[PDB]
């Protein structure tokens, strides 16, 4: 009658041990999260820098196309 409680208390113990096992095994993969976030942030910031640089070169391109066109007519 009491030994069912003693062999349940053991069942509960290896459920606690097995949870602490896996919890240590996946704090390893959980410490790549911040690494993955930083890599994504760098590629995002880099992309935005390339986009702003492209828009600036667009402004200049179209500004030069004018000067060229006028001074071609002029001469």
């Amino acid at each position: 009658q009491l030994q069912q409680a003693e062999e349940a208390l053991v069942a509960k113990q290896e459920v606690i041990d097995k949870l602490k096992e896996e919890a240590a095994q996946h704090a390893i993969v959980m410490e790549t999260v911040p690494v993955l976030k930083a890599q994504a942030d760098i590629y995002k910031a880099d992309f935005q820098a390339e986009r702003q640089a492209r828009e600036k070169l667009a402004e200049k391109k179209e500004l030069l196309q004018e000067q060229l066109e006028q001074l071609q007519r002029e001469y």
Partner: protein, 76 residues
């Protein structure tokens, strides 16, 4: 004393570096620069989910041969 550490890039590459525990983080980055051509001022080294300061040492972070180190960087 004189040991081998391994730095995991997210492109899969493992960079093997011979270092001393007293080697500073800007020193590791210079070694990485010599092997991979990534400028130091553009490398971020990680260990236990934290970024490593250029001015502290491998031994200030208790970094061993088995320690899991990640390199993240810019392609600009």
């Amino acid at each position: 004393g004189p040991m081998q550490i391994n730095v995991k890039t997210l492109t899969g590459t493992t960079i093997g570096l011979e270092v001393e525990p007293s080697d500073t983080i800007e020193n590791v980055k210079a070694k990485i620069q010599d092997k991979e051509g990534i400028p130091p001022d553009q490398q971020i080294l990680f260990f236990s989910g934290m970024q490593l300061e250029d001015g502290r040492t491998l031994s200030d972070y208790n970094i061993q041969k088995e320690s899991r180190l990640y390199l993240v960087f810019s392609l600009r």
